[PDB]
Amino acid sequence: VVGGDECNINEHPFLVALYTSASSTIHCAGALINREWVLTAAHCDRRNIRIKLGMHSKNIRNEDEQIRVPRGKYFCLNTKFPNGLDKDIMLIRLRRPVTYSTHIAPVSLPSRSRGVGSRCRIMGWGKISTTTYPDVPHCTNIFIVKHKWCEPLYPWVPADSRTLCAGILKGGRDTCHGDSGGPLICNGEMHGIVAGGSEPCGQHLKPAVYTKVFDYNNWIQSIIAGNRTVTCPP
């Protein structure tokens, strides 16, 4: 996240960090949505993925910090692109659930749709400048803006895309490399999943793309329920 500051150590209990057994590099984030499920982006998947919950600093462990591996991964059945990245979302079932604690708590899915003008918060362990990756997650506020700002920048993201276009039109604040999968929080709810954006991050008139969670609410709840034939919104 560029243009922001260190997040408050207690404001992101639902935030999880994704890495692998092969490296300590955090390549994405995700959000805990209940004791045994994590919501993130499909492109964050790795064959040997590891998930850190209850973490702030990558090096200084919180007393209740936990490590988990998946017992299952779920993607949209029906997608336009062969790689499914037109519906960049995935659910990870934790091998063992976590116990809610001071630094570990679920975030709510959207209770209603939020659009243009809504102020939201982004957060992650992604790049904070063209040269630096942080050790603690950084946060900042952005706005959902008209989808038109994104359409010309990302040809692969149509006006009919189940995505939210968001950022600061002035430039300066934006998610960045390594922030994918993390939550776009609006009014205490997870309205988006960081997908992608422009290069470099934070440019004037170049908001980024976040998977619009509200649309997948039924799919998400059905997978959690145990359904395995349900499909994502068309």
């Binding site: 990245l85 990302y154 692969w156 490399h177 922030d179 994918s180 960081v194 997908a195 992608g196 290069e199």
Partner: peptide, 7 residues
């Protein structure tokens, strides 16, 4: 999808 897009 452009190579610089996914974060």
């Amino acid at each position: 999808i452009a190579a610089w897009y996914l974060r």
